[PDB]
């Protein structure tokens, strides 16, 4: 409803100055998430960031207040400013490790220096290593609780292997960013360079269907594994010394194969 | 198999004599994991940390290694052995929020005193703080999925309630043991005050389930987050100040069920 969304525009406006009349030391405030983005559903919170100039400051704040006869849930990380500028050298954690754009809409900074650093559209953040020796223990643990009739623990195992497998696949696809999680699925599911199966297998294993058992799920997990490693090359900079030797000398083949 | 099984523990006596030998700097070396519980099988990997004197030391070895007729996949952390030590303090990434104990079986240190400071059972690590902010934020996702008719995200923001609930749960139940990530879903599923559906809706929730619903989800993730929320003590100390002062004024509530 419009007079909703209007009523949060506001709220955002007047929150600007309440967040700045609460924090003294605040140097800058910045709108997150959905609301930054232009996003935003009838749940979807209100998030701010707050920097301060106080050295290893870090809160989080809530608020539920009134827009109408509803009620918004606001929340402000309050952080100091050099702390929050460095963290664009570490992967996020919500994105499968895709690199993301972390959505940045400036509402507030206490002078020309700091407005001029911080008016960015996001923060950027790497993607995560390519972990093949971890994905490799989880198929292994896949298999050894189908050989027990765990079934939890299949799908619990492949859960692992879907969370590890885009890491894999990132430096062998054309380079995407997402600036949120729901966009990440988006992106993973897109790539074009993939091993038979993937789309389907990944979510399988993920957990993000309607249907699948034990056998089903082993099964995805095997081939999403067993083809992706048939696709990457032998750089031990990006896999690892020992994994990239492993896999010239034909030893995770055999491992794998045995 | 009983020769396989014997292979290995030969393999793992003189694959300690061998990372003695390559790392001079180690003062101890540890078995983790599988075979260090005596619950290992066919695919499980032989996991080491060995623990050296020199600092910011972080390695990832790895090596595919013949037991007879087999190949067996062994690793080992290479650690600053104080860098080691200090985790204790940090919770586990494994076990959905759950404290754990981390098996550890030391077959080697340099002298007695760094024996008697490392030979322990296990290295434990602490639960996960309360996250009621973020599995509130998680539930009007699901809501807003629901609303737009995105299954997929139905499903994701599930997950993301399934994983924070636990941290919720912790506070309201007796201290859990969890040695490994299969155990952890063992305790959390025998957590004895939980609410009504709470071990069906938490597996649905997570996706570790053979038949499900974007709708069946979404009244699983209705269920588990009202049902934990009312059963929070209004802690301050436990919850964040803000969120004990929304929870005891109803404003909490008010917005779950607006």
Known sequence: ENLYFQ????????????????????????????????????WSDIDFDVLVSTQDVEDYRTWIEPVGDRLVHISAAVEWVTGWERDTVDPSSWSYGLPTQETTRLMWAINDETRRRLDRPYKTHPAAEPEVEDTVEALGKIRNAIARGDDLGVYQSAQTVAKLVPTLLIPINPP????????????????????????????????????????????????????????????????????????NAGLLEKYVQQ
């Open 176 to 247: 995407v960013t997402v600036s949120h999680a729901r966009q990440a699925i988006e992106a993973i599911l897109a790539f074009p360079r993939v091993p038979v199966g993937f789309a389907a297998d990944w979510l399988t294993c993920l957990g993000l269907v309607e249907e699948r058992s034990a056998r089903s799920t082993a099964a995805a997990a095997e081939r999403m594994v067993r083809g992706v490693l048939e696709m990457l090359p032998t750089d031990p900079d990006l896999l690892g010394e020992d994994i990239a030797r492993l896999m």
């Open 7 to 42: 009523g949060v525009q506001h709220t955002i406006a007047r929150w600007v100055d309440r967040l700045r009349e609460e924090y003294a030391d605040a140097v800058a405030i910045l709108l997150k998430g959905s609301y930054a983005r232009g996003d935003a559903a009838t």
